[PDB]
Amino acid sequence: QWALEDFEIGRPLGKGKFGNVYLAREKQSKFILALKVLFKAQLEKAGVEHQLRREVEIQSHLRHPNILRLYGYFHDATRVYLILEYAPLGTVYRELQKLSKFDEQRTATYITELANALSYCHSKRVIHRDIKPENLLLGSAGELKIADFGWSVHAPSSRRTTLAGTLDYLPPEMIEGRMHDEKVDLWSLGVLCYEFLVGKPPFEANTYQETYKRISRVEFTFPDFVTEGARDLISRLLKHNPSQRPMLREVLEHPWITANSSKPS
């Protein structure tokens, strides 16, 4: 159906390990979108064909205001192309680099939007497993959308693929290669809440080896400026035992969230 000739390509929007993402306009309708380009030789070499299939299958069927749309795809014997909703305000990662830290209202609003998106995902037993600032995009009204479903799966699960880059957002059960479920995304939500308020993630370290140690032992402390309500929510999410981590309704109803968020459940 779709082919490369149907699109005019424009400015580079971002890069990932596999994805090179470009702004593009479809020629007959003038529809603006984002084209995510993957090289087949790199996909085959890394053995991640199955991840790509899951990204397409899972993401194309989800429909939620806080989740990025996948519209379709095509390929041409050197490349695979994913046709995505364009997010005009960029990544949360870029906003954090710009501002250094977010205030409590901005943070609580982003957490509400994440929790709504994840609540919808978990109702289908979909777990994302790669929630982190460079995969959170911003729509035209500044609203958060979750993207990059390459690591997503159905629960429960083990891991069959090699961990790539940073350990910073993963819970103990994932880094220890044990069996895991939906509660992995709740741990990541706690890491994000800390990083939004403080400006760095809570187990950050100079080497892989020490980061691993800090995560498995849950070694984090708070700077003086983090308030009692934020500390309570974060401490509830960063529990070693996944069954003790709260439900998403409990996050959305937490008094610090309700006091500070400017959007509803």
Ligand SMILES: Nc1ncnc2c1ncn2[C@@H]1O[C@H](COP(=O)(O)OP(=O)(O)O)[C@@H](O)[C@H]1O
């Ligand atoms: N729909 C989009 N709109 C705007 N920018 C995007 C979009 N998708 C990706 N990007 C940019 O490209 C980067 C990589 O895309 P991603 O889908 O996360 O690739 P990878 O799977 O390689 O991590 C993002 O972190 C962001 O900077």
Ligand SMILES: N#CC[NH+]1CCN(c2cccc(Cl)c2)CC1
């Ligand atoms: N390397 C490689 C081989 N590819 C593996 C998976 N492929 C795939 C999966 C979902 C959607 C689309 Cl367009 C393509 C195509 C070929």
Ligand SMILES: [Mg+2]
């Ligand atoms: Mg990504």
Ligand SMILES: [Mg+2]
């Ligand atoms: Mg990916």
